[PDB]
Amino acid sequence: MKIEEGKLVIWINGDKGYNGLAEVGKKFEKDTGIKVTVEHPDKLEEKFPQVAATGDGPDIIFWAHDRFGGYAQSGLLAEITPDKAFQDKLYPFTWDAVRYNGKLIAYPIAVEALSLIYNKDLLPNPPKTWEEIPALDKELKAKGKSALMFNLQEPYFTWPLIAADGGYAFKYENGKYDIKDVGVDNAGAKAGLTFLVDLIKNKHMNADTDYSIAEAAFNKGETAMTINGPWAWSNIDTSKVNYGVTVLPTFKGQPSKPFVGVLSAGINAASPNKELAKEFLENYLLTDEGLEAVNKDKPLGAVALKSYEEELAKDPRIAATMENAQKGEIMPNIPQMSAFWYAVRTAVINAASGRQTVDEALKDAQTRITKLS
């Protein structure tokens, strides 16, 4: 549709609780008479710049914070200025994830970290270690099962392994990220992707498995483990798989370091409904009842709102999510992050498919990222 004064349009990814957010929309409309339309288009993070200037696109856009600094660089985001009373309702470190060049450019919603999810019936004692997965897959294959399936088409899911032995995106040193110091082809990064590719070479994993195939196999009881975030928990609840959430496997003794995202709601700088957007986000979404309605649809993870997080922290699944988050790092929000994801995605896909060696896939990824900053 088209952006119009008097009504809100919200974009959020299809794997999130858009039906729950729509319930918050209905509450807002009952209170204010302002209809709220929640859409989940494909490739919404790539479309938002090409539509904000034309007058399409949303009033409010949800995504992990890593993309927002590139949006702010093009002026697509409105500066958010909550007063001290509202800022204190969210954890300080989540505000930092949406601060770009001194200005807050979004509202933090929830904190996302990948975890090892496993079938308690197929696997009462899951492995603590990547190195013991092949032997486990061999034993499960003889019973008609597999050990591990997760999305190999998005580098997000492979990055905890790559970073375990020392891979990193942009080196952070004393205040800022060094955009010319990229760490995707260093020794640790190469050792991580190499281990992944040898799982595939030895038929302990399939290069073509994406999100749906990984989810379906685990939720049907065909694979013993998957790697996913909290949004996936709802579909597992429905499947009636006795599942647990636990610490990611280690590699060469070191923990996997997932890239941590803060799901954030930015306001289109050209929105005719700036105030309504802040009103909706501050007074309806970022409340105990609002986050509850979204979380019941698809779990958010560690919510940024402290009052609601103190209740969710008692859940062992959330405790495991936080533990994996403490071992990883929070993503940078700098504009160079889109070049980083694009290039690492090619490296992972080429290496897994055999189109390239692990070494030259990561060396090519390194060259592309460094040259473009």
Ligand X SMILES: OC[C@H]1O[C@H](O[C@H]2[C@H](O)[C@@H](O)[C@H](O)O[C@@H]2CO)[C@H](O)[C@@H](O)[C@@H]1O
Provide φ and ψ at 298, rounded to 5°.
-140, 120
329 touches ligand X (CB under 6 A): no
**Environment class of 101 (CB within 10 Å of its CB; exposed 0-12, middle 13-18, buried 19+):** exposed
Question: By CB neighbour count within 10 A (0-12 exposed, 13-18 middle, 19+ buried), where does 53 fall?
Answer: middle
Is 187 a binding residue for Cl ion by CB under 5 A? The answer is yes
The CB-side HSE value for 123 (13 A sphere, CA atoms) comes to: 29
In b/e form, how buried is each residue of 194-205, taking b as 16+ CB within 10 angstroms? Answer: bbbbebbeeebb
- Specify the residue, 224 or 348, whose C-beta has the smaller distance to ligand X: 348
Which residue from 155, 258, 290, 299 is in contact with ligand X, where contact means CB under 6 A?
Answer: 155
Number of residues this chain uses to bind Cl ion (CB under 5 A): 17
**DSSP structure class, residue 77:** B
Distance CA 219, CA 295 (A): 20
Q: Does residue 255 contact residue 248 with C-beta atoms inside 8 Å?
A: yes
Residue 323 in the binding site for ligand X (CB under 6 A):
no
Task: Please state the closest distance from residue 341 (CB atom) to ligand X, in A.
Answer: 4
Q: 259-267 and 329-330 as β-strands: parallel, antiparallel, unpaired?
A: parallel
The answer to the question of residue 64 lying near Au ion (CB under 5 A) is no
By CB under 6 A, is residue 64 in contact with ligand X? yes
Alpha carbons within 13 A on the beta-carbon side of 225? 26
* Least distance CB 249 / Cl ion (angstroms): 20
Which of 251, 341, 362, 365 is close enough to bind ligand X by CB under 6 A?
341
| Site for ligand X contains 215 (CB under 6 A) | no
- Residues in the interface with ligand X (CB under 6 A) total 12
Restricted to residues 280-319, the positions that interact with Au ion (CB under 5 A) are 302
Q: Is 78 in the site for Cl ion (CB under 5 A)?
A: yes
In order of 28, 157, 189, 207, 371, the CA distances from 356 in angstroms are: 51, 20, 15, 13, 20
Q: Closest CB to Au ion among 311 and 359?
A: 311
Q: Does 330 bind Au ion (CB under 5 A)?
A: no
153 interacts with, out of Au ion, Cl ion, ligand X, none, CB within 5 to 8 A per kind: Cl ion
Does 186 sit near Cl ion (CB under 5 A)? yes
Closest approach, Cβ 124 to ligand X, in A, equals 29
Segment lying near ligand X (by CB under 6 A), choices 130-138, 151-159, 249-257, 284-292: 151-159
Q: Is 211 in the site for Cl ion (CB under 5 A)?
A: yes
What's the chain's length in residues?
A: 373
If one asks whether residue 150 binds ligand X (CB under 6 A), the answer comes out as no
Beta-bridged to residue 177, according to DSSP, are 172
108 counts as binding ligand X under rule CB under 6 A? no
CB 331 within 8 A of CB 259: yes
Q: How far apart are CA 35 and CA 28, in angstroms?
A: 8
Residue 209 near ligand X by CB under 6 A: no
Binding test (CB under 5 A) with Cl ion, winner from 35, 46, 55, 93 = 93
Tell me which residues in 95-124 interact with Au ion (CB under 5 A).
Answer: 111
Alpha-carbon distance values, 196 to 49, 203, 234, 343, 348 (Å): 34, 11, 28, 18, 9
Residue 252, token pair as written in the block: 């060469």
* Cross-strand pairs, 183: 168
Shortest spacing between CB 301 and Cl ion, in angstroms:
15
294 binds Cl ion (CB under 5 A): no
**Residues near Cl ion (CB under 5 A):** 78-79, 91-93, 99, 102, 153, 176-177, 186-187, 210-211, 269, 329-330
